[PDB]
């Protein structure tokens, strides 16, 4: 199976400053149409996962602007322009496009100073 | 509108069956594809097995971690999703959420509550 | 416990 290997496991910083996550597929991550079934989720302290952007890179109805992901291939990374402090939690990348789907280990997005 | 919500899961013991169940509420959920995604105490979150809707025949694929033990269904009438695990066992103990694709290239656009099970005395 | 009680792909 295809694993995703997404960096770092924990990401402090100050609310107001830009935020990136990195996910490292293993192998391309194309499905059989012309997608990449790459999502990512933001799941907050002890309360269900969130869809953030579906595609490599379309943003979730209800999802604020800050948020934003892309780079096709084997290297993908969401991107948060400014950090809230309700965007605090635990961020994961999904890939469905190749069965057995699998998510990423996730990456803590706790506040640093 | 969109409403999921799970209920079966519980205290079992080591082996042994458990029925997971999630209704619909908001969406002709014969149209969508379904999940049972698995996040146990520990960590990571962990696609379990996926049911597609009619467009697609209702296809199913499981991870291998529930190959042959778990098995998913749908009650399209009654608008539900069920699980069942059998002979389970300790990675098993673990909130096991609800989820629906959305009608582009996404697998969760809506996750339920989430229902516990502990597995393991 | 209680009553009557590479690989990779
Ligand atoms: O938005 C329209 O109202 C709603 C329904 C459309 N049919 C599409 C669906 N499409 C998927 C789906 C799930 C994973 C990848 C690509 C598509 O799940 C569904 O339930």
């Known amino acids: 199976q295809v694993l995703m290997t997404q960096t770092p496991l924990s990401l402090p910083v100050s609310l107001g400053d830009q935020a990136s996550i990195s996910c490292r597929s293993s192998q391309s991550i194309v499905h059989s149409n012309g997608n990449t079934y790459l999502e990512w989720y933001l799941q907050k302290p002890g309360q269900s996962p969130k869809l953030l952007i579906y595609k490599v890179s379309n943003r979730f109805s209800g999802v604020p602007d800050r948020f934003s992901g892309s780079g096709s291939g084997t290297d993908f990374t969401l991107k948060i322009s400014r950090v809230e402090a309700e965007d605090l939690g635990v961020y994961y990348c999904?890939?469905?496009?190749?069965?057995?789907?699998?998510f990423g280990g996730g990456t803590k997005l706790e506040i640093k100073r | 509108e969109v409403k999921l919500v799970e209920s079966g899961g519980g205290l079992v013991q080591p082996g042994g069956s458990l029925r997971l169940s999630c209704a619909t509420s908001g969406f002709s959920f014969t149209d969508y594809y379904m999940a049972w995604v698995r996040q146990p105490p520990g960590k990571a979150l962990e696609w379990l097995a996926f049911?597609?809707?009619?467009?697609?025949?209702?296809?199913?694929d499981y991870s291998a971690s529930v190959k042959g033990r778990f098995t998913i269904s749908r009650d399209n009438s009654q608008s539900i999703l069920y699980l069942q695990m059998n002979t389970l066992r300790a990675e098993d103990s673990a909130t096991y959420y609800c989820?629906?694709?959305?009608?582009?290239?996404?697998?969760?656009?809506?996750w339920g509550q989430g229902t516990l099970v502990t597995v393991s005395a | 416990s209680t009553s009557s009680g590479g690989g990779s792909a």
């Open positions: 999904f890939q469905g496009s190749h069965v057995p789907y699998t």
């Open positions: 049911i597609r809707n009619k467009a697609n025949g209702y296809t199913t």
């Open positions: 989820a629906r694709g959305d009608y582009y290239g996404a697998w969760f656009a809506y």
